[PDB]
């Protein structure tokens with residue numbers, strides 16, 4: 012069919028990647044041993060997109076696990092679905108990256124990238140018609156941030172006409188203590204603006220706020236944050252994994268969502284979200300468009316929507332979905348740019364998630380995403396103002412010009428979002 | 438002799454082709470395995486239905502059709518569907534990667550890899566014809582294959598089959614069932630590129646069909662299956678003159694003479710009646726007068742526009758079923774006294790009538806009631822330019838910001854092709870204004 | 878009248894052949910122009926990426942010098 016190759020890099024990348032494979036394996040009826048045990052042929056119709064079929068009627072994720080230290084991938088292999096992954100697709104070093112983008116991008120990460128590229132080629136060469144790649148990683152560390160973006164550039168060199176998609180976890184002081192994350196994130200975003208086609212912005216600040224304020228979790232853990240991510244990743248990949256008319260492949264999704272090449276950073280959302288200590292189509296619609304349900308710490312009412320994709324899951328009235336989707340658009344027409352007519356697209360999938368009878372997934376390309384990049388830029392400049400902690404990076408051969416260039420590119424990206432937010436038709 | 442080759446391009450063209458060929462088989466008594474127990478001419482013949490069906494020595498009646506799509510999943514349903522035995526595998530052509538709702542990919546990047554094979558297969562069908570009359574091309578405006586590959590195919594057909602007639606059934610986009618933001622781009626690009634290569638194009642506004650299904654068939658949320666069964670009835674009415682013979686039967690090319698006054702002005706407005714549920718038809722017998730009156734209700738048009746705000750250049754009535762000229766003439770006389778029908782000053786005001794006697798039929802399990810008589814009106818009205826205006830306006834909104842244009846340039850297209858296409862549409866709109874201004 | 882009759886049908890033949898010829902040449906130009914444009918865009922992309930590869934080697938070379 013149209014195969015996707017999945018890559019997970021670094022600690023965060025491998026942990027959210029493992030949770031993604033657990034969730035969609037349950038949806039497609041695949042057990043930890045790779046055998047199908049579902050009850051619906053719809054589970055197998057597009058299984059080729061993410062799984063290879065091996066000997067013995069077993070399904071193996073088209074997934075590559077990358078890290079510069081063995082720790083996280085050891086726990087994945089010893090995890091719930093650790094036995095489903097191809098053992099030859101574990102590629103790891105020993106030196107680690109020390110939360111250093113330069114180490115991931117230029118030194119230790121560059122030492123290992125050729126070994127990762129070897130397994131990418133084997134998975135791609137066994138594809139009937141490869142459509143592209145999806146990468147899971149964080150931007151605040153060293154391996155997922157530095158080596159992840161190095162992988163993106165090197166893969167793009169060998170597959171320049173394929174779609175590059177990432178799930179990029181943005182750092183926040185509410186989750187991580189390390190001080191150099193604004194540096195690592197700014198250097199990474201500079202790469203993502205140039206070399207990816209579509210990026211889901213998974214903001215750890217939004218994940219924390221949802222767990223704390225909405226879910227009433229006093230001390231959110233990484234498991235709590237990743238629980239939100241796996242539900243979101245299952246939602247935004249539903250159109251790729253099940254028969255459907257809308258955004259059924261990575262390229263059609265990109266053509267619908269990206270009106271300008273650099274503005275390809277999506278705000279994802281999910282509904283319902285409520286604490287455990289306590290549903291209609293109209294309520295699903297209003298929640299999915301509410302700022303509290305967004306996985307990027309941005310208020311969409313502070314900007315305007317370029318494009319939106321909405322996916323409803325479960326058994327429900329399509330007529331009601333159609334009415335409510337046009338209802339929210341007409342009532343909030345100020346927040347959708349008028350010079351992109353019919354910029355909101357809606358899909359409905361009959362098979363709902365495990366524990367819910369109805370759910371909704373939101374994918375927004377909003378100019379309000381600049382609030383996320385402004386937050387990172389503010390933290391970057393507060394440190395770069397005083398050349399703080401730079402020796403970790405210049406010691407690997409980097410020059411200060413590369414920081415200045417990365418900062419200017421992200422400020423340029425912010426200016427671009429504001430330009431199209433202010434643009435008018437008449 | 439007088440054979441017609443149908444070409445179905447992309448998902449919309451293929452799925453509509455499925456509906457049309459299923460309906461044709463029911464109208465002609467052709468079984469899903471291609472056998473036709475009424476056709477005593479085994480392996481050949483010059484019957485009227487032979488314009489659309491060839492015949493093998495084993496008695497199979499094979500559609501003179503090619504199905505083409507740049508991805509396989511839609512045509513794969515034909516290969517395994519109820520009418521799989523109807524087609525030979527060579528008539529069903531698929532690639533592995535579609536045009537991604539991008540005209541540039543259907544016309545250039547992906548389409549160029551399969552165009553030669555498609556032409557070879559069309560040539561195989563043409564070689565079996567003793568007097569090929571032309572082609573019928575089914576496609577969407579909005580899809581990357583329906584827009585881009587169709588225009589490439591139409592360009593190549595003009596080279597390989599000179600001026601042999603090419604007619605279109607084109608699916609005009611509607612937001613209720615649209616899948617791509619860039620459909621206005623694809624629509625303008627393919628309309629510009631195909632304009633000089635098409636002799637006659639019947640546009641089908643998905644929103645008009647959607648509204649008819651909701652209003653007349655009580656369907657809450659019509660699907661493509663709902664839309665395509667209605668569309669196939671309209672297509673069948675238009676092609677009925679080619680597939681059946683009779684003494685009141687007027688050939689489509691004779692209607693075409695009246696419908697195309699200038700080469701570019703070749704977009705007839707189709708209106709069809711009656712569209713009625715079985716629960717409503719069970720009481721009423723709708724007369725010739727009632728179905729004829731319904732042809733002048735704008736709610737029954739296949740393209741949303743207001744002919745009361747334009748001028749007519751031609752009016753054709755294609756009846757099928759239990760209809761005699763006496764009742765047609767009385768119905769037309771009533772219509773002219775009570776209806777807003779203004780012609781341009783340079784064309785005759787009469788109505789051209791054809792009657793095909795075999796009654797219409799319906800696919801089992803459908804929503805349309807089986808009626809004793811139906812009618813399709815084909816009019817050439819300046820009001821159909823309203824459909825171009827709506828598309829041109831959505832084009833202008835996005836192109837002024839160059840929104841999504843990088844997807845087309847990335848596949849080798851130039852910005853000049855956008856403006857060249859848009860200027861051709863502007864001239865076409867001005868052409869429709871000019872034809873409707875009184876002489877001096 | 879006979880010579881006018883032959884001139885009419887010769888004109889019809891010439892117009893049809895010229896329509897075929899011009900449609901053939903225009904399509905050949907479009908496909909060649911499109912092929913050149915798309916290959917030029919891919920080449921610009923790969924050259925930008927190769928500029929990044931050399932920069933990765935200057936960084937590694939610069940780290941080695943400061944040891």
Ligand SMILES: C=C(CC(=O)OC)C(=O)N[C@@H](c1ccccc1)[C@@H](O)C(=O)O[C@H]1C[C@@]2(O)[C@@H](OC(=O)c3ccccc3)[C@@H]3[C@]4(OC(C)=O)CO[C@@H]4C[C@H](O)[C@@]3(C)C(=O)[C@H](O)C(=C1C)C2(C)C
Pocket residue numbers: 030033034222226234235236238239241242243245246283284285286287364365366367370
């Ligand atoms: C895979 C897992 C868990 C895991 O092991 O990951 C590997 C999973 O959760 N999948 C689900 C899914 C969703 C979309 C696509 C695919 C799958 C689903 O099918 C399910 O089971 O939801 C779970 C999730 C819940 O925990 C819970 O949320 C949380 O407390 C929580 C804590 C931290 C982070 C996130 C949530 C959940 C919420 O979250 C959801 C998702 O609904 C939150 O607000 C939502 C409203 C729900 O009513 C409410 C409140 C529940 O009360 C409900 O009783 C329940 C269900 C229906 C749980 C209590 C068991």
Ligand SMILES: Nc1nc2c(ncn2[C@@H]2O[C@H](COP(=O)(O)OP(=O)(O)OP(=O)(O)O)[C@@H](O)[C@H]2O)c(=O)[nH]1
Pocket residue numbers: 446447448449450452453506507535536537538539543577578579580581582583584608609610611614615616620643661662664665668
């Ligand atoms: N009436 C009708 N319209 C359809 C059908 N299928 C698709 N469409 C319309 O066609 C347009 C989308 O084009 P498609 O035909 O699906 O795309 P395609 O030709 O296959 O081209 P690509 O998939 O981009 O390669 C939208 O306006 C749809 O509403 C159908 O079966 N019936």
Ligand SMILES: Nc1nc2c(ncn2[C@@H]2O[C@H](COP(=O)(O)OP(=O)(O)O)[C@@H](O)[C@H]2O)c(=O)[nH]1
Pocket residue numbers: 020021022023024026027108109110111149150151152153154155156180181182183186187192215218233234236237240
């Ligand atoms: N949501 C989420 N974020 C994580 C997880 N693990 C690490 N992070 C974030 O990732 C950043 C650290 O990057 P890390 O993955 O440890 O660096 P690397 O392993 O060298 O690539 C911090 O900002 C963390 O908040 C996780 O499991 N879930």
Ligand SMILES: [Mg+2]
Pocket residue numbers: 022023152
């Ligand atoms: Mg860590």
Ligand SMILES: [Mg+2]
Pocket residue numbers: 447448508535580582
């Ligand atoms: Mg298609």
